[PDB]
A paper describes a structure:
A single ER‐localised Fic protein, FICD (HYPE), catalyses both AMPylation and deAMPylation of BiP. FICD is a class II Fic protein (with its αinh N‐terminal to its Fic domain) and an ER‐localised type II, single‐pass transmembrane protein, with a short cytoplasmic portion and a large luminal‐facing catalytic domain (Worby et al, 2009; Bunney et al, 2014). We report on the transition of FICD from a dimeric enzyme, that deAMPylates BiP, to a monomer with potent AMPylation activity. Mechanistically, monomerisation relieves a repressive effect allosterically propagated from the dimer interface to the inhibitory Glu234, thereby permitting AMPylation‐competent binding of MgATP.
Author numbering:
A (entry chain A): 105 to 433
B (entry chain B): 103 to 442
Write the structure that this text describes.
């Protein structure tokens, strides 16, 4: 019961429980996730395994519940600047790999092959996370030939066509264009993303209220005003001062939070993310299909107070993209 | 100008000696060299009445007078045939009206009618997409709409045309048919938005921005298209249009939209749908311009552009009859062949 599982895990730490300590710490927070002592003690336990980022999260969560909790505050005050350095140090590692892909001359036969294949790779994964059953070979066939695939839903194949049209529009019209991003530009991306599936709802705002896991987004009445504030933030001086990868990740989150469409919210958000990156001089990033579980958890964590685990998750995806380019080239 | 005044005379002397088929071919060749040859129209009009073809004869005389108003030989013939054709045409609408009453006489929930009304829905889709060069079969179009799975080795654009139509008819049958009040420019765009939405979601429900050729027809410039549609919907809701016979009003509404050609694509499909909305609002079943009538469908549209729209109005009335003939036949066929 309450305050029971922690002590079991805490005495196990003295013994050297190893996995047995962790399992009980996880079970203790399963019964009560707002148990301030279980967070602080599991935070201390995390630093023993050199996991300072996880520890800082647990302390920050504990203080959001109990601001004046001494044991958590004295630990956070130490880790707060330490993590800020670790995070900034990770962005500088990414910035060096981004410079190493720009160092490669345009016209390289190796890069052309990768940039081509990774375009289809991005489409496969962005549709696969939302439960599209089409393979990479099938998605290649759809876009190359424009003939339908045997024994597969027309809705699934129109999702693929919708994405290709949306990226073509971005890469052509938006990426290079001078000036601010408008509410019109966001609708125009969605109009292509969902146009071939639902031509009625494509490029028009959500009219009904919906549940997204455990997230209840703004009411259709408010959605319009939420988007006017969102585009104002995108063009704000504050947002320009942020590191591209962070600004991209925050732009992503704020759109999936507002959830202004009946469908294509995740897809439009992942596209808008890449527009921010490509406008700042970063290649298009792919949140892979197998990262669906993680992708949601960091979005859950973002809703409850701390957005950083999401910002880090995007930066990790950014690195794996850059790693794939430099390797394949 | 006597390039084919020898071809007329050639055909005319052939008529005297008999030369039934030989006369026609030369009359057709005479109008091929000069289609605005007033004597070739009037003489071929006289020739037509000999085969009891008064409708064709009246067309030729009316065409001749549009070129040469005061041409005596044509005028004396037209003055006779003008009221005669008006009677023949009105008599055809009364034949249709009796067959429309005979489909309403059939009970509301008849099991035989339900089967036909279902099959003819897919039949209408097959033909409306087939005329514009869609290669999908009837069985394939049934599979698309029933299962919502794609067809092997056929373009996604062709299959999205089928989905676009089904959505457009569903919207019409549900929202528009039963709705009280006037038809608006918004309603026309909303039909097109579904018709073309699954193929071209960008241009769906938005007016033509560029100028295009349609066979030998140059439609109003994109600048004027908006005003042409405001006058079109004003005519649709006008008292004059309500006084016209449903089949004529349907056919004229069809023509005026394909004339204006206010979209990049889906002009014919939107027109054929709007036609059926007029008919169904007046209490007529949805009519199908079949795929094999593509050649005829264009000729009567050409004929309409040059002055006389009646051949089109008659072409729609003929399609209306063949629809009603198919329903009454199949319904009586199934009544015996099905249980109940
Ligand atoms: N708890 C959450 N809070 C906020 N956003 C979330 C949450 N879980 C998932 N999301 C985001 O919203 C999407 C889920 O929305 P939903 O399930 O309605 O749409 P989908 O069909 O999965 O994808 P799409 O929005 O691309 O059509 C995810 O793809 C993700 O980007
Ligand atoms: N000479 C003509 N004058 C007026 N309208 C014509 C003429 N020829 C064809 N049309 C109309 O235009 C339609 C064909 O237009 P067009 O060839 O641009 O489109 P499509 O792709 O064949 O068909 P849709 O309009 O259904 O997409 C015909 O169905 C008819 O309604």
């Amino acid at each position: 019961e309450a305050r029971a599982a922690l002590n079991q895990a805490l005495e196990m730490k003295r013994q050297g429980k190893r996995e047995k300590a962790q399992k009980l710490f996880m079970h203790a927070l399963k019964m009560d996730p707002d148990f301030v002592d279980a967070l602080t003690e599991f935070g201390i336990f995390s630093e023993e395994d050199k996991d300072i980022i996880q520890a800082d999260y647990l302390y920050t969560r504990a203080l959001t519940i109990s601001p004046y909790h001494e044991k958590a505050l004295v630990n956070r005050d130490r880790t707060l600047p330490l993590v800020e350095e670790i995070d900034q140090r990770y962005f500088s590692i990414i910035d060096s790999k981004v410079k190493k892909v720009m160092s490669i001359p345009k016209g390289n036969s190796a890069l052309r092959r990768v940039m081509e294949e990774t375009y289809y790779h991005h489409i496969y994964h962005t549709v696969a996370i939302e439960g599209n059953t089409l393979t990479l070979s099938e998605i290649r066939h759809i876009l190359e030939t424009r003939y339908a695939v045997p024994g597969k839903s027309l809705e699934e194949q129109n999702e693929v066509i919708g994405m290709h049209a949306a990226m073509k529009y971005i890469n052509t019209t938006l990426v290079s264009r001078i000036g601010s991003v408008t509410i019109s530009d966001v609708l125009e991306i969605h109009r292509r993303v969902l146009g071939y599936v639902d031509p009625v709802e494509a490029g028009r705002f959500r009219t009904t209220q919906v549940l997204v896991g455990h997230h209840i987004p703004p009411h259709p009445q408010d959605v319009e005003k939420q988007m006017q504030e969102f585009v104002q933030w995108l063009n704000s001086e504050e947002a320009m001062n942020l590191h591209p990868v962070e600004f991209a990740a925050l732009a992503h989150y704020k759109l999936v939070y507002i959830h202004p469409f009946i469908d294509g919210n995740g897809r439009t958000s992942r596209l808008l993310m890449n527009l921010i990156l490509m406008q700042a001089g970063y290649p298009p990033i792919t949140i892979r299909k197998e990262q669906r579980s993680d992708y949601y958890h960091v979005l859950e964590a973002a809703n409850e107070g701390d957005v950083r685990p999401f910002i880090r998750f995007i930066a990790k995806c950014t690195e794996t993209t850059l790693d794939t380019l430099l390797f394949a080239t």
